[PDB]
């Protein structure tokens, strides 16, 4: 159930977020916005020298507080422990924003199984492990998990097979536990963000060789959705998608199945 207010920067002030993939692009902007709202941010990325710059410029923008921990999400242990640390560092946690991904480029898929596996590992399994680790704290606070996905995690695009596989997976997994949290009275929201082409560095480089959209706002929308506990956010420069992307039938089928079968079965 979305909080039925409208968004206001106040909602974030004093709140204990975590952004991953915060060293650049969308993730970075998010830490900043968070900063401008006076959140306790705890950033993360592989780039340790760069994280500092970001933390530092977050304190400059107004953060209640701001730290970074640098690790690779290829590593499940790092991911798990990371969350504990960001905990102690911030004295609990209100919001897990899960944004990072492994590198990829635009190519037909031919036989790089290793790239498929790694994409699943970094883009998906790590998100879960982050999740499992962070759930306890979030229960205490009735917090939120925000998950950054893409049009290509809703509809099919060539040249990004591995990456799509992993974005879909996020939908499947997280929508599913959303059903579960609900039939279990576990009061943690989960927001899935579906983004179109955004003007990050990485994206602009790979496509340079379509209309992109402003990374500053995209990041703000992500934060709004999360704050308002919406199930979903759509953010694309086009106006067909925002309207054609939503799946009313899916919603109907879920409704039917949910109100027709207790889940109190066990």
Ligand X SMILES: C[C@](O)(c1ccc(C(=O)N(C2CC2)[C@H]2CC[C@](O)(C3CC3)CC2)cc1)C(F)(F)F
Which residues does the annotation place in the binding site for NADP(+)? 21-47, 72-73, 99-101, 163-167, 198-202
Residue 74's binding partner among ligand X, ligand NAP, a second copy, none (Cβ under 5 to 8 angstroms by kind) is: ligand NAP
Which one, 152 or 193, has the nearer CB to ligand X? Answer: 152
**Pairwise CA distance, residues 167 & 256, whole Å:** 26
CB contact at 8 A, 17 and 34: yes
Residue 102's binding partner among ligand X, ligand NAP, a second copy, none (Cβ under 5 to 8 angstroms by kind) is: ligand NAP
Residues facing residue 147 across a β-bridge? 98, 192
Residue 169's binding partner among a second copy, ligand X, ligand NAP, none (Cβ under 5 to 8 angstroms by kind) is: a second copy
Q: Which residues are catalytic?
A: 163
Count how many residues are written for the chain. 266
Give the angle subtended at the CA of 161 by the CAs of 125 and 166, to the nearest 5°.
Answer: 15
Residue 166 exposure: Cα atoms within 13 Å on the Cβ side: 26
Q: How far is the CB of 228 from a second copy (least distance, A)?
A: 20
**Pairwise CA distance, residues 107 & 95, whole Å:** 34
Q: Binding to a second copy by residue 265, rule CB under 8 A? A: yes
Q: Binding to a second copy by residue 157, rule CB under 8 A? A: yes
Q: State the number of binding residues for ligand X (CB under 6 A).
A: 17
Contacts of 257 (CB under 8 A, 6+ apart): none
Q: Which stretch binds a second copy (CB under 8 A): 9-17, 39-47, 57-65, 127-135?
A: 127-135
Q: What are phi and psi of 43, to 5 degrees?
A: -65, 165
* Sequence positions preceding breaks in the chain, C–N over 2.5 Å: 209
Q: Binding to a second copy by residue 106, rule CB under 8 A? A: yes
Residues facing residue 69 across a β-bridge? 44
Pairing of strands 65-70, 189-195: unpaired
Contacts of 245 (CB under 8 A, 6+ apart): 151, 154, 155, 194, 234, 236
Residue recorded with tokens 């992500």: 222
Q: Binding to ligand NAP by residue 23, rule CB under 6 A? A: yes
Residue 12's binding partner among a second copy, ligand X, ligand NAP, none (Cβ under 5 to 8 angstroms by kind) is: none
Q: Which of 17, 39, 197, 220: binder of ligand NAP (CB under 6 A)? A: 197
Q: What are phi and psi of 14, to 5 degrees?
A: 90, -10
Q: How far is the CB of 52 from ligand X (least distance, A)?
A: 23
Report the interface residues with ligand X, using CB under 6 A: 104-106, 150-152, 157-160, 163, 196-197, 202-203, 206-207
Report the interface residues with ligand NAP, using CB under 6 A: 21-27, 45-47, 50, 72-74, 99-103, 122, 148, 150, 195, 197-198, 200-203
Report the interface residues with a second copy, using CB under 8 A: 76, 106-111, 113, 116-117, 120, 124-125, 128-129, 132, 151-162, 164-173, 175-180, 182-184, 209-210, 240-241, 244-247, 249-250, 252-254, 256-257, 261, 263, 265-266
């Amino acid at each position: 159930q979305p909080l039925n207010e409208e968004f206001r920067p106040e909602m974030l002030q004093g709140k204990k977020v975590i952004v991953t993939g915060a060293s650049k692009g969308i993730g970075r902007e998010m830490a900043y916005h968070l900063a401008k709202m006076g959140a306790h941010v705890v950033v993360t990325a592989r780039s340790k020298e760069t994280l500092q710059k970001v933390v530092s410029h977050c304190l400059e923008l107004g953060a209640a507080s701001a730290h970074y921990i640098a690790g690779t999400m290829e590593d499940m242990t790092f991911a798990e422990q990371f969350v504990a640390q960001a905990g102690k560092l911030m004295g609990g946690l209100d919001m897990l924003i899960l944004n990072h991904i492994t590198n990829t480029s635009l190519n037909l898929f031919h036989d790089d199984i290793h790239h498929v596996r790694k994409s699943m590992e970094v883009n998906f399994l790590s998100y879960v492990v982050l999740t499992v680790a962070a759930l306890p704290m979030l229960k205490q606070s009735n917090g939120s998990i925000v998950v950054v996905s893409s049009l290509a995690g809703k509809v099919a695009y060539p040249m990004v097979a591995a990456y799509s596989a992993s974005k879909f997976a996020l939908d499947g997994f997280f929508s599913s536990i959303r059903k579960e949290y609900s039939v279990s009275r576990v009061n943690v929201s989960i927001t899935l963000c579906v983004l179109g082409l955004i003007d990050t560095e990485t994206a602009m480089k790979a496509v340079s060789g379509m209309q992109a959209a402003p990374k500053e706002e995209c990041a703000l929308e992500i934060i709004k959705g999360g704050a308002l506990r919406q199930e979903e956010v759509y953010y694309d420069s086009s106006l067909w998608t925002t309207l054609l992307i939503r799946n009313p039938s899916r919603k109907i089928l879920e409704f039917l199945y949910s109100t027709s079968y207790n889940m109190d079965r066990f």
